[PDB]
Amino acid sequence: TDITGVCPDRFAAVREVFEQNFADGGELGARFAFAIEGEVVVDLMGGFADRKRQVPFGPDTLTALFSTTKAVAALLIARLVDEGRLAYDQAVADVWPEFAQAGKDAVTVEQALSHQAGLSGFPDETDPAIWFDWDATCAKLAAMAPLFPIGSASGYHPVTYGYLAGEIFRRVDGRTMGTALREDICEPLGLDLWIGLPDSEHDRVADLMRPTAMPQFGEINPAVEAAFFKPWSSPKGAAEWRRVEIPSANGHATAPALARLMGALAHGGTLDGRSLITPAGIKAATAERLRGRDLVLPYEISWGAGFMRNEPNFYYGPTAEAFGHSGWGGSCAFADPTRGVSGAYVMNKQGNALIGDPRSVRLIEAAYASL
C-alpha cells in the first residue's frame, strides 16, 4: 500500500500504525489527520476511493461521515447558545411551539441534544422516504410521545437527532444548518466540509464498502427497535441523499477539514485567527449532561450537548474530558482542549463497531504517544 501525505519525524509511530491498518485487507481507502492548536501536523492518505481500487483516496476525496456529522450539528447549536440567541436550558417548545405536543412542553435544548427526549426512532408504521421531507419528519417528531423518561437513560437518536437539532437551529438562526455552516465557517476558512452536497462535488465522493457483518447491539427494547430495526429506521437514490441536509448522518468531508474544525474547539474557539465560539461556549456545550448505559448504543456513554465525551471508553485517546463524535462504519472526529490537540479518521471501508473502531483508536493512541 502506498501511504502519502505529511507526517513529521515526531509522529513516525502514526505512519507505522496507519500502514498497518492497510495490512491484510483492513481498509479500502482512508485519511487520518492530527492537529495541534488548530494546525494540521499529520495528514496521511492510503488506498482507494473506489470499490474497483482504480482511483486513489486522495487530497480532494470526500466521504460520507454518517453520525460523525453530529459533532458538526452540536457545534452549530453551541454557537447559537454562545451568541445568546438560544439557551441550553430553554424549552424546545419555546422556539418550536408544535414540539409541545404529547407531553414534551418542558423538554429542553440540552435534553434533546443529549438523547434524553425519547424520540430515538419512530415506533409506528412510517413511509421510509419521510426522511427526504424535512417538514414531514419534524412534524412527526413534534407530535410523537417519548419512548422513555427524561433523565432516566440516554437513548441514542441515530437519525431523528439531526431533525431535532436542525429544526431548532433553523427556527432560531433562520438558515439551515448546512447553509450557515457553509456561509459562516467553511467558505471563509476554506474547509472541505459540507452538509448538503451540490451535484458538482459528487464525482469526488468515495464509494462505500458496506460492513461484512452487523454490529452487535444490546438487549432489544422499544428505543433500539425504533432507532435501528424498522423498515423506515434509515433514509430514493444516492444523489438526493447527498443533496439534502441530514445533520445526523449525511455530512461529507475530508479528515483535515474535521481536524481543523475540532481543532478550533481544542484551541480556545479560534481557527486561523477567526473566533468561532468563546471558551465559555465550548465549556457549556461539552459539560456532561448524563452518563450511564445507553438504551440504544450498547455502551456506557457520557453525553454533552450533542458531543460524545471521551470517558469512560477513551476511544478518542487518554483525556477523559476530550469530546467528539463517531460515525457508522468507523469515522470519527474529536477535540482535546486540555492538550490542545484534535483529529479525525475518515474511511470508506465500513466496520461493524458502532464507536471505537480500532483502526481509529490505534491511530489516535499513536498520535498521543508521540506527544
Automatic annotation (TrEMBL):
SUPFAM superfamilies: beta-lactamase/transpeptidase-like. Residues 15-353 form the Beta-lactamase-related domain. Pfam families: Beta-lactamase. InterPro entries: Beta-lactam-related, Beta-lactam/transpept-like, Beta-lactamase/esterase. It comes from the Bacteria. This is Esterase A.
